[PDB]
Design a binder for this molecule. Sequence first.
Ligand SMILES: NCC/N=C1\N[C@H](CO)[C@@H](O)[C@H](O)[C@@H]1O
Ligand SMILES: [Br-]
Ligand SMILES: [Br-]
Ligand SMILES: [Br-]
Ligand SMILES: [Br-]
Ligand SMILES: [Br-]
Ligand SMILES: [Br-]
Ligand SMILES: [Cl-]
Ligand SMILES: [Cl-]
Ligand SMILES: [Cl-]
Ligand SMILES: [Cl-]
Ligand SMILES: [Cl-]
Ligand SMILES: [Cl-]
Ligand SMILES: [Cl-]
Ligand SMILES: [Cl-]
Length: 836
Amino acid sequence: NDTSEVMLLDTGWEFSQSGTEKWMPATVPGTVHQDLISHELLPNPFYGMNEKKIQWVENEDWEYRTSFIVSEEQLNRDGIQLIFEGLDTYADVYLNGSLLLKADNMFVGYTLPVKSVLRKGENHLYIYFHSPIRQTLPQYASNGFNYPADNDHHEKHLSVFSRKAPYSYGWDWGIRMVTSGVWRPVTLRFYDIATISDYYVRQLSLTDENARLSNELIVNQIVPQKIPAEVRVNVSLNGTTVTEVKQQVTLQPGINHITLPAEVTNPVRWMPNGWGTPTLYDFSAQIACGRIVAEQSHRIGLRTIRVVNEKDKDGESFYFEVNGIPMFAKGANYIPQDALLPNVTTERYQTLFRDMKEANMNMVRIWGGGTYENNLFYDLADENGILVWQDFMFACTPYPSDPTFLKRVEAEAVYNIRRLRNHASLAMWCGNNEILEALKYWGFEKKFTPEVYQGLMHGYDKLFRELLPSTVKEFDSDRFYVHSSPYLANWGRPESWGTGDSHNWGVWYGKKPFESLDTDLPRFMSEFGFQSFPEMKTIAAFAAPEDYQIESEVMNAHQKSSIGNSLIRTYMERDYIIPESFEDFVYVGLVLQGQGMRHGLEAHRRNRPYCMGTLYWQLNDSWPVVSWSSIDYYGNWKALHYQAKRAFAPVLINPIQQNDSLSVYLISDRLDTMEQMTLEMKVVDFDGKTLGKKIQVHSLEVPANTSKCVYRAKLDGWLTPEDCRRSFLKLILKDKSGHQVAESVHFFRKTKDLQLPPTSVSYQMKQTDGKCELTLFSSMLAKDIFIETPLQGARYSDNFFDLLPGERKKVIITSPRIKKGEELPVNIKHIRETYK
Ligand SMILES: NCC/N=C1\N[C@H](CO)[C@@H](O)[C@H](O)[C@@H]1O
Ligand SMILES: [Br-]
Ligand SMILES: [Br-]
Ligand SMILES: [Br-]
Ligand SMILES: [Br-]
Ligand SMILES: [Br-]
Ligand SMILES: [Br-]
Ligand SMILES: [Cl-]
Ligand SMILES: [Cl-]
Ligand SMILES: [Cl-]
Ligand SMILES: [Cl-]
Ligand SMILES: [Cl-]
Ligand SMILES: [Cl-]
Ligand SMILES: [Cl-]
Ligand SMILES: [Cl-]
């Protein structure tokens, strides 16, 4: 790219519990905890009861060191920077007897000039990590009150004082692992003349005819003299130059600001998943001095995103318009993928994006108790067409608002805005998760003096209604900012539901039936959710078979919701027969979570345009645990993930039965209108036998981006109460020529009320390396089948589906660990097997 040399400081690291003078080898980027685990100086933190056994670690201070060689030629480079991409969190950095930095913010990268401090030969870098606990005890003692951060699992709520991942202190799906370390990469760059400190591609306008861009560079020149240079930007697509521009300058010592306009005639637009291809241009900036001294590139998607948050007859809208088109959001809330962030590999990031894309998602919310994600996460979002909703890292509690605290926050906002603002995927910023709801509704006015309450409320505006929005206005001025999610709507106050986004915790916390999701509608569902135990092979990762009970000591470690296990059973009983075995209860809870949550995702699409988005709580897990996730910590799709895929299909046939009547909707998020369509339905008993005749509705159109009712029939005079216990509605949609575009199955009763016949799902298997093809068959309906394998992370073409009477079904299972002639264990469960 340029004449610079980059040296990665990622080997030869050692660490030491401070005070012990004992050093061991370490892995950087990494965490104190992993370094310990690696030397069997800690038990597996995720196993059994080990959570209390690992806590002493947050009480110690930790030291890291490494050495490296610098040559005489390297020392003669004009400039040399040490970059820390992340230090978790209070870290005194020493190089060659010099204090370079007293770091205090996990979310900020630090760029340090070090040429004057480096030595020909060996060079020594020592980092001292103060315990974030010990560091902040004096700060808490001075405070004279404990902030109400309930997810901070300690008597003293020290999380609020530290710019450090909130979930690291614990969360209602998480293990408390208050860790430290060089958590992102350390690099040394030897260079001449200058570096590009920032390259921002600012889009000025975009139409079908022309994109106009402004390339804004910040160049830090490190030499004393004036340096003539030419600044060049190359725009290319798939390896071919689309435009080139250049500018003559003379660079002065210190910072230089350079602006180059550029246009792309007839731009190829970036579109979200479902609406086209996520086209990314390559924008390359270079500083040329008679030598390319510095270069920086971004991949750039040309699109418009506008969040429309406007007064209207229903209250206040909250939706996304993408390239001019209202786009119904389909997605989920994302949390950190591990208790130990640097453990998450490229592959795990890649598979997670495959999981979102395969489930037809077009949006992910990076919720405010995690981190601002790494550059890879956003690159993946860009290339998968996944819009990103970015919370700032504040969740559930009020925070300090003193000048020093606000200076630290300003630093991280400026850092991460500039870091992330070139991503096509980045759709909006949100100041916090639920802090205004908390201050309004969670009873603080009874827990604090009126004086401290008032300081909390003034402290809110300082940060969320002034500092954060001004910073966005300055550094990302065409991106939407909202102070909090949910901004106004509260789940207990129906009057508020037509105003902005909702977190509807009526289901789950409010104990409301899944059917409440059909009546209790938001403008945009930014959270709603339901727990499940993960499958058996995940339980066996943390629990020995002795412990396989809901309420074992090992189980209950792994349940961070203290009302959780009881709600699951309560809800199961409403809709399913509760199984006697632990294994079968786990199976039915997967089915339960999946069926209830998809009924909600359907209600939200069905009720477009009133509702314009749904993001379920939650996508993923940071460790082996019972949670609201649709994908467990090992990558295994729960029922919910297959059900989200189906509920989010571009065209969906949605039968909805209420008041002893059936309605059928056709729901499209396609950009084209379908014409001359035929919906066809027939009632089929559980042995395979059609009941009555096929029902036809011809001449249907399905306009782009609409939900419409095309069929209603009362159940009375159609099916007896007995038929409803014994049959199902099969539904297909086809074009004029009879080509199937969609299908659905509908049951008229709750599963516990169905007369399921006893039955055997048989299968043939054809197994090769990396692959099994299974062919399944049952003469009678088999309800909600679970094809279970002991192979962690095995992927399925389908699972958690109804095997219909006498209808063969192909299922492909893939995994790098599938060996030809080591026959894959397969256990097939279905509802009827679960009770006798
Ligand atoms: N305040 C409870 C509702 N909100 C949420 N539910 C999740 C599960 O309770 C929790 O992990 C997040 O904080 C989220 O914002
Ligand atoms: Br320097
Ligand atoms: Br200190
Ligand atoms: Br520098
Ligand atoms: Br300048
Ligand atoms: Br605001
Ligand atoms: Br009904
Ligand atoms: Cl408004
Ligand atoms: Cl809306
Ligand atoms: Cl990274
Ligand atoms: Cl108080
Ligand atoms: Cl006061
Ligand atoms: Cl409806
Ligand atoms: Cl894993
Ligand atoms: Cl229904």
